[PDB]
Design a protein around this ligand. Sequence first.
Ligand SMILES: *[C@@H]1O[C@H](CO[C@@H]2O[C@@H](C)[C@@H](O)[C@@H](O)[C@@H]2O)[C@@H](O[C@@H]2O[C@H](CO)[C@@H](O[C@@H]3O[C@H](CO)[C@@H](O)[C@H](O)[C@@H]3O)[C@H](O)[C@H]2NC(C)=O)[C@H](O)[C@H]1NC(C)=O
Ligand SMILES: *[C@@H]1O[C@H](CO)[C@@H](O[C@@H]2O[C@H](CO)[C@@H](O[C@@H]3O[C@H](CO)[C@@H](O)[C@H](O)[C@@H]3O)[C@H](O)[C@H]2NC(C)=O)[C@H](O)[C@H]1NC(C)=O
Ligand SMILES: *[C@@H]1O[C@H](CO)[C@@H](O[C@@H]2O[C@H](CO)[C@@H](O[C@@H]3O[C@H](CO)[C@@H](O)[C@H](O)[C@@H]3O)[C@H](O)[C@H]2NC(C)=O)[C@H](O)[C@H]1NC(C)=O
Ligand SMILES: *[C@@H]1O[C@H](CO)[C@@H](O[C@@H]2O[C@H](CO)[C@@H](O)[C@H](O)[C@H]2NC(C)=O)[C@H](O)[C@H]1NC(C)=O
Ligand code: NAG
Ligand code: NAG
Ligand code: NAG
Ligand code: CA
Ligand code: CA
Ligand code: CA
Lengths: 316, 316, 316, 167, 167, 167
Amino acid sequence: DKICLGHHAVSNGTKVNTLTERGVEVVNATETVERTNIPRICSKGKRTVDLGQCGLLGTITGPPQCDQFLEFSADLIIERREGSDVCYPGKFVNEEALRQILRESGGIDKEAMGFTYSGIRTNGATSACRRSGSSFYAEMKWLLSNTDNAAFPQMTKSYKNTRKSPALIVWGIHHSVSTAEQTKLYGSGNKLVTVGSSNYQQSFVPSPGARPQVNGLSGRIDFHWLMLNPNDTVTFSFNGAFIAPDRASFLRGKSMGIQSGVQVDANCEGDCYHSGGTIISNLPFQNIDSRAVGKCPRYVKQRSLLLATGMKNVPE
Amino acid sequence: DKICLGHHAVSNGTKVNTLTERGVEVVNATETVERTNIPRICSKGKRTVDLGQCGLLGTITGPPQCDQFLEFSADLIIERREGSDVCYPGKFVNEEALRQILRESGGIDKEAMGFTYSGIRTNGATSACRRSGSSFYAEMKWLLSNTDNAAFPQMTKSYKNTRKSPALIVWGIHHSVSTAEQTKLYGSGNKLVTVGSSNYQQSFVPSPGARPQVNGLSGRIDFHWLMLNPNDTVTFSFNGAFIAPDRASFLRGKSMGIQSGVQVDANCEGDCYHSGGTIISNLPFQNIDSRAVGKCPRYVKQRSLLLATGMKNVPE
Amino acid sequence: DKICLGHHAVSNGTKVNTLTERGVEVVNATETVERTNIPRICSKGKRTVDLGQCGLLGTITGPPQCDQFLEFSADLIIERREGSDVCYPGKFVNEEALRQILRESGGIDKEAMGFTYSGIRTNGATSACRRSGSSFYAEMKWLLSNTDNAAFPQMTKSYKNTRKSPALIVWGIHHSVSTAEQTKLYGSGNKLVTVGSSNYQQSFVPSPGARPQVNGLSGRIDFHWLMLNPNDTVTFSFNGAFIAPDRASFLRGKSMGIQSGVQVDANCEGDCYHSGGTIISNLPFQNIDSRAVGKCPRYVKQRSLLLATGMKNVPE
Amino acid sequence: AIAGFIENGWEGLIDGWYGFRHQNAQGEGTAADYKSTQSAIDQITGKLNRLIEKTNQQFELIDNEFNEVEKQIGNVINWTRDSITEVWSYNAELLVAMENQHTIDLADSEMDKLYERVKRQLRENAEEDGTGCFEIFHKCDDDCMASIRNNTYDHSKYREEAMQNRI
Amino acid sequence: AIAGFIENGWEGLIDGWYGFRHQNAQGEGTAADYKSTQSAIDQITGKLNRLIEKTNQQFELIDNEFNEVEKQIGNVINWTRDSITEVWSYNAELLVAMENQHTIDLADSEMDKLYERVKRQLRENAEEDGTGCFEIFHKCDDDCMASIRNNTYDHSKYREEAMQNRI
Amino acid sequence: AIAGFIENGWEGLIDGWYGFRHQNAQGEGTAADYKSTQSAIDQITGKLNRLIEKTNQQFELIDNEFNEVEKQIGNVINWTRDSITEVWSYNAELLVAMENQHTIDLADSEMDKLYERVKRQLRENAEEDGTGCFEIFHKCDDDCMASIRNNTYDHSKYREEAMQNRI
Ligand SMILES: *[C@@H]1O[C@H](CO[C@@H]2O[C@@H](C)[C@@H](O)[C@@H](O)[C@@H]2O)[C@@H](O[C@@H]2O[C@H](CO)[C@@H](O[C@@H]3O[C@H](CO)[C@@H](O)[C@H](O)[C@@H]3O)[C@H](O)[C@H]2NC(C)=O)[C@H](O)[C@H]1NC(C)=O
Ligand SMILES: *[C@@H]1O[C@H](CO)[C@@H](O[C@@H]2O[C@H](CO)[C@@H](O[C@@H]3O[C@H](CO)[C@@H](O)[C@H](O)[C@@H]3O)[C@H](O)[C@H]2NC(C)=O)[C@H](O)[C@H]1NC(C)=O
Ligand SMILES: *[C@@H]1O[C@H](CO)[C@@H](O[C@@H]2O[C@H](CO)[C@@H](O[C@@H]3O[C@H](CO)[C@@H](O)[C@H](O)[C@@H]3O)[C@H](O)[C@H]2NC(C)=O)[C@H](O)[C@H]1NC(C)=O
Ligand SMILES: *[C@@H]1O[C@H](CO)[C@@H](O[C@@H]2O[C@H](CO)[C@@H](O)[C@H](O)[C@H]2NC(C)=O)[C@H](O)[C@H]1NC(C)=O
Ligand SMILES: *[C@@H]1O[C@H](CO)[C@@H](O)[C@H](O)[C@H]1NC(C)=O
Ligand SMILES: *[C@@H]1O[C@H](CO)[C@@H](O)[C@H](O)[C@H]1NC(C)=O
Ligand SMILES: *[C@@H]1O[C@H](CO)[C@@H](O)[C@H](O)[C@H]1NC(C)=O
Ligand SMILES: [Ca+2]
Ligand SMILES: [Ca+2]
Ligand SMILES: [Ca+2]
């Protein structure tokens, strides 16, 4: 009589790798590298803003595409390829740092800066910024000499941050197509804009000249920004070519920002995003997108690594 | 009769983690992640300079807080939060790079640059830089027109680095509160400062205008620097708004620089520092401060990871 | 009678480290950290360009040392310490990014930009750029006023990239020795160069002034660049001090670039390079140079780590 | 006809990982061992709990897919990202190769423990045949076989008969 | 009343990691085995020597706690730092789980080596009881027990008596 | 004079990693075991295939050995490079220590397997001497020794004679 000890085996074994062998068969195994993508932005449980044609930096200056987002609030901010920060052509200086500040901001709450003016026009407008006809950035004012060619008075305007959070302050410098145009708008002579806080000082001289027409226009407005500390003051001194802020921005809280080309889906939950969707997974690794962001499995180069969940498979 | 083989066990076992189990009890274990901080800067064996109210960049220009450190020598440099680089308001351009050059410098040896002047005043002074009354940066000269509103002669000054090491050269540009003040100091008309070596040329135009009062003053002096190679010459050309160097700086050797809020202790030795003290440990990991510097255990997120130093504990 | 089971041993054992012991002897072992260098650049199977006295950035502008490489083609590009980008003194701005773009380029194909001029001279030349006497950068034109001191007309020139690849556009700014010389060349008054595409705008002001002689000359020409997208236009607006491009560059394909002080050897093949030669190895680690590039073993600090390829060595 | 783990595994053992297969006058039968089976599964579950973890660390964009960052900083970021990727790809490959080796050795070790236990229960009443079975030198009916499986076989009861049969 | 390592460990064994516990006419006693104990301690000490290392690499500040660096470079620095932290946290957790698994297996393996050695000294004179003990089939007084412990027990001397008693 | 693996290895075994050494009336002799030898070599070769890998990832220069980059970016690059170097140096030391421990334990475990196989072939006809040898309790000439080596020894043929000699 006899008794034998044994272990199970299957005919359908699965190959894995060990320290000493490639492709040893085990009874069972499981994937460690995530390849399955959901082609949507799984936004359940999160206040989500889909910026559409509004570029993220445009929420601060307010071209017409951004009119609905001037004071937006969100946990999750989505930028889109069609998004433009601008109506009158130009760009933000140090733009990516500011995008990175705004992506995590929770959104922005705007506050009037209280500037008023005398001896000048305030109504500069352009057909590039269309609302009910020619208009401009909602949050800014294109300051002009009182009449064509007239002299633009030397001016100083100051704003203090009364709040307990740093204020985001933005202004513009207008680079006319020619010295002729710059004279028409602001009066002849050398133009200078200075901007100072207790921790920041910089000077700006417009530089007129021709550049390629963008939206039929060859001028440019470049935007500059700073963070103004609680209790600190910012002072602007200028005699023209200045695009003045009407309001400051305060950051609301916390958010995450992504860039994406797929639709939002408020019915699925997720925390790991890339431009093509959402990686929903508990696996420790992923091979979908090395730039994925949020709380993500780690990106690896290999498409598959099988972890044995059973013994060596030894069939007869 | 009989004989048994056995192993020890204890009633006070310690839990550790393995590849297959959380919280298996072992006879003995030891910590691998350092948590114990010494709330002092253990400076034994090192020439240590505690900068106090002197900001590190101030050692080069010489506001009154820095008078004792104009030629300092050290192995370990400590910056403090109360440290200011400045007396008359302003700041250094490209400042952090320069701090990083000075933290590892071993200190600085100053050399007279040999400039002398005629047709101008050399005695600009301010109540912001207090010594025996109004004064100025020890290493610089505030050059003025000979009398109020008089014309400032066009000038050129050159210095050659005779040594075998690069010279740190610093100068300033003065931005007056108004074009009225700039005229009082340096005479009316356009001001220009040009600075050239064999590898560097740049132009500076002062930009007068109102800035918020810092120390009761609305002007700013901003500081610029360059590294002048052995045998090369730096040439300054200017007709006002120029804060001239009196001396160049040469780096002495090697040091480490930290930022801290706790006291120095010359009786304890150590090599790993952070703002809250010294991490004295041979453990391979630490959970105290991810920005610790010197020769340090590696920063991990976990507070504790126990390494078994005995066998499985199997009591009866 | 008896039978024994045993295993081999040798008298020449090799010491290795394990988790529990330093220097346990094994029957056989192999090195895991590469220390053997080949003091040549092993270029077999690769179109290799050894730039010699030509600096990589010179291939774009064309000083005389680079005349043979104006439209070079390669898989492997080697820069040398004697390489200079320049003939007239100066340098490229943002130089290292451009080097990085060129090292991987496959080389460059040049295309005429089609600019023509009236009302000015186009023949600026210098003894620093020697061909058959005084000459200039092959790919650029030193634009001057029609006659000494005459006014330099305000000018605009535009180029559109018709190709399917980004165009590398380069231009220069001339910083004269003095405002007198700047007047002789370009007429008196403020000089300004503006450069704009749909994604770029920047302004340049020359800064004349005295500085040390380099090659007997105190003037400088500094070079700037941008990447012009397919179908986009660049526009230059300027009234002097402008060194104009004659041609644009398009990148050919793919390459790798290195910096080296040893000879090329077209008879040995290799893919990991550093300045002192070629690391030919299948080991996973190397201790030769932490800045080696190509497809390399990973740099480690240890000189040696022996992997056991045999059992414990237990001699009698 | 019947053989143990040294030859191969049993495709017919579907109730467990480890088991007993016997042959006596009443025929052949197979039964899973619940304890060794569970001990192996628990160690695999323990591995999975450790390896199926999520990082809690949040990362943000430092790069821009629509509007390319400045080339110098972009190249530093890409170099850093590719170096980090090399590290994680290496760690992942190693983790799995090292864990699969351990999983396989651990499963075999649980088989040896069961076998060694049964050997010690049987004492002088059986011999090893070299395939993972014991030739039992007394009559061992279905109750007896069950007593070996559930660890209550008393060798003393059969020793006299068995030792005599072994000579 | 007396049992070995298969049941549990001995709280009363305070002179060593491994030992012998005997029972004969003169009573019960326990003694540590110095060699196996020292072999295990030396392997743990070997681990500690390797793991209680210091880096010799010096790192410097690239950041500023009093006056914040520019935001773009600051976010690159912090992304890089947090990636490096993830790497080290993961290596630390793995290092300890792997080393503790090995420490535990190594200690059990030293116990098995000692047991196997005694089994082979005893040859045909003893049988395993299944708790980690040997039933010795001859009178084995204190001097005989000591000869087992110090590896001089000569099985031939007792074999005639023992083999007869085993039947 | 003759002994097995428990005492030490054999310098004279040059045809293999493991082997058999015998003593009978016709003298002493030693032969390699091809199967166990090859099983070990194949496991080492499997390691080497995994560890002698090339990265396929291409890296480029981000730094400049002839003309130093700007200091702030240089310091970030150097910090990042040194941190990466710390990670690789640590991984390389651990990889080799861990693999060497496994290589050693695996080679011993192949020895034990062979020994255990021979034990089981011999059944009741031999006893362990404690040095890694079997005292065989019947005459075993060169052809018998060969049948042990090639796994065709039939213990039934000699059992009667051997069991009697063991008493
Ligand atoms: C421990 O020992 C052996 C034997 O060492 C050898 O024996 C004597 C000749 C000595 O004086 C030694 O110098 C000599 O190495 C090692 O194996 C041996 O390796 C050598 C060197 O790699 C082999 O030489 C080969 O020779 C041919 C043609 O001459 C070449 O084409 C090959 O490239 C190769 O180098 C040699 O054949 C081999 N010896 C035998 C008998 O097989 C062993 O590796 C060593 N320990 C370690 C860690 O390497
Ligand atoms: C072969 O391999 C795997 C082992 O990885 C087996 O599937 C796994 O089974 C476990 C538990 O039995 C699953 O856990 C579950 O996880 C969810 C997730 O939130 C939890 O809520 C549940 O309560 C549950 O515990 C695990 O997910 C699953 N793994 C995978 C990748 O699907 C499989 O059944 C094995 N086959 C056999 C025949 O044993
Ligand atoms: C001691 O260990 C060393 C190092 O592992 C042994 O040398 C190695 O032998 C292997 C297998 O034979 C070599 O592989 C060969 O190389 C290439 C690529 O695979 C191929 O051309 C060959 O056909 C073969 O596969 C390996 O190169 C070689 N390594 C080194 C560094 O020499 C050596 O044989 C060992 N000595 C003894 C006595 O066992
Ligand atoms: C339990 O383990 C610890 C930690 O390894 C032992 O303490 C160490 O002993 C070594 C040398 O034996 C000393 O060099 C270290 O100073 C000790 N390390 C620490 C962190 O304290 C300790 O003795 C052990 N306890 C017992 C009873 O064995
Ligand atoms: C950085 O990597 C991305 C791939 O993620 C690539 O598209 C981009 O062009 C790289 N940047 C440079 C400057 O090569
Ligand atoms: C970088 O990290 C620290 C915490 O280490 C944080 O205080 C600082 O704000 C971070 N920088 C940015 C721009 O988020
Ligand atoms: C960066 O490292 C290199 C060595 O690789 C050194 O020569 C250089 O000075 C270091 N850079 C700085 C800015 O300290
Ligand atoms: Ca509001
Ligand atoms: Ca001095
Ligand atoms: Ca061409």
